[PDB]
Symmetry: C2
Subunit: 346 residues, 2 copies
Amino acid sequence: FMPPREVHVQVTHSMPPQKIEIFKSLDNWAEENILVHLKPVEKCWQPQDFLPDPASDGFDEQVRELRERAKEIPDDYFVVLVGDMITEEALPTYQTMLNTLDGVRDETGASPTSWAIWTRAWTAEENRHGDLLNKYLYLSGRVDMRQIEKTIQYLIGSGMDPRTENSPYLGFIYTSFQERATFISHGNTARQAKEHGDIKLAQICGTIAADEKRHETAYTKIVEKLFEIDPDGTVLAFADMMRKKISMPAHLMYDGRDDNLFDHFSAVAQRLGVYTAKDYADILEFLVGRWKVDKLTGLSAEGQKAQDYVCRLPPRIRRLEERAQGRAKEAPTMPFSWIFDRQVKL
Amino acid sequence: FMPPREVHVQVTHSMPPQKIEIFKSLDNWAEENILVHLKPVEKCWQPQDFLPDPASDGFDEQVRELRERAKEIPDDYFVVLVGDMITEEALPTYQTMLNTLDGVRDETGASPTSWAIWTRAWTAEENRHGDLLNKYLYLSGRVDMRQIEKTIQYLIGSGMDPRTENSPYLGFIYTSFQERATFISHGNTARQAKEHGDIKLAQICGTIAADEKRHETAYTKIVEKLFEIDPDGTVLAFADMMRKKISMPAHLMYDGRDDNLFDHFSAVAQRLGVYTAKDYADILEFLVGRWKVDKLTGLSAEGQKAQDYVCRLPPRIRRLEERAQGRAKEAPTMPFSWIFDRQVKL
Ligand SMILES: [Fe+2]
Ligand SMILES: [Fe+2]
């Protein structure tokens, strides 16, 4: 019953150590540019805002309406939603990931540094996503919670190596790409929940999307400054990540039944138009756009090629991955333990 | 609206670096002595096992029975249960904490080392506790979930510095003490749920207790080997931790309303006999017993005093903290946002 393992040689601490200082120097910069994308907790929504109120006489009719509505939502959607939700619940991993990063790590668990304050805050904000989606899914009755729980335990046990090699350059680029992927993801699960008549679920997805967009803005701003301070190392970092392809935090997903669970979940996501290969491209083009990569000049021999590769990658990735031919018609149907081994097209 | 902050100078990397090797050496030892307390995921219980089944015709009558029973459980209990639950949900922090530890850290997020495998697995096991208690509490309708959620967000944002200084010696002693504290905690919330007629909740707490006992056994076994390999550094570490007093992972608890929320939650917990100053002693006595600290001989000048301090501490802590006089009668009554500002004795 072994889950899938990371298949690539594991590289640690691949950024010149003499560069930690730049992040220690950037500390106050971060305090005034990042710790603003922090809504005070009192201002933040909480999951309870979107769920039946267990301390109200309303509770029953609310739970009943929730379920009544969930019937008009297809299984394929739920598979995607569930996958989405599982990714979210693997958060401990993700915090841990951010804390592998060399100049921006929380050395104690309660470090007073801007980098740490941000990490602990982002995590606290992120924690509400799992909770919300979880309970929603629980209440819905449309899904197999035990299999979903099992999946999550496998996932956290497995972890992820996003191949950031302990580099804040790579780490912050990764998360930049990452968070945008899930803004689109939820953006669409939201759009689609409305289309299937469930405004309250659309609201759940939409709010989660808003949160991921705010975080996107923050991590890009860190990278923007890195591009500004150290163009060379940064372009190099961006090209490195793209060469490796960004791998989603949930790729080692496993439910004890399906050895290609991630591939399969992603396929459904793609068929429904929730998150496509097309989007993956749109992300780094946006990112090449945002970081004005084309507008950079004066770099090292190695910088030249890195820039050009990263600038010219989206059109190629576009063609390469727009031949949905074998799979945008004769995709097989496949069971999913998350929905009691009911089946959906791939 | 600022939460409480850690009040002690933050010390990092206080273990001689030349000692990382001992943990790298201990790697295979850990694989055959620790990765056994790993029940395969398939064998593990999941939260759904203890909750109403949302995909059953039974769901309603189950939710109904759950709440009917929660009425016969007093508010003070719930305060304790909720605080217990919040501590649990601060898990991201705790994984992060274990990963601050120098020779036992996960360098990548999916490190193939025994130490990392254990950390990721322990975390995946621990994740179920929050989920379970959360949903239970949500269904119960006896508690204010929004205030609980808000508390959690503050908590994760705040984190904890358990003062382990990046030392696996200190880290593993901390978690050794820690996990035993919550085995007792849950042991008693369990006993007491039965006493108030809610067997299903007793089962929830009892199962969570079983998990923590398994983990206790593992972390003590790491420390046992450390005592065995390096008696000096270890006794020194144990005395250091005790001098500092072990601080619970949730001490910086805050709900936007009560500036001494931890103290207040702990007080209720003490009044109900869930976790007392008396217990805190019983833990390190058990630990001084378990690690046969008294039976050690041949140490350094500094080792002598460290051993004796640690051996003779529990009786003193016992007398010192058994004068529940000012507080084991005329404790004030106090509101708790976790229960809609209803009040309980302290
Ligand atoms: Fe998220
Ligand atoms: Fe626990």
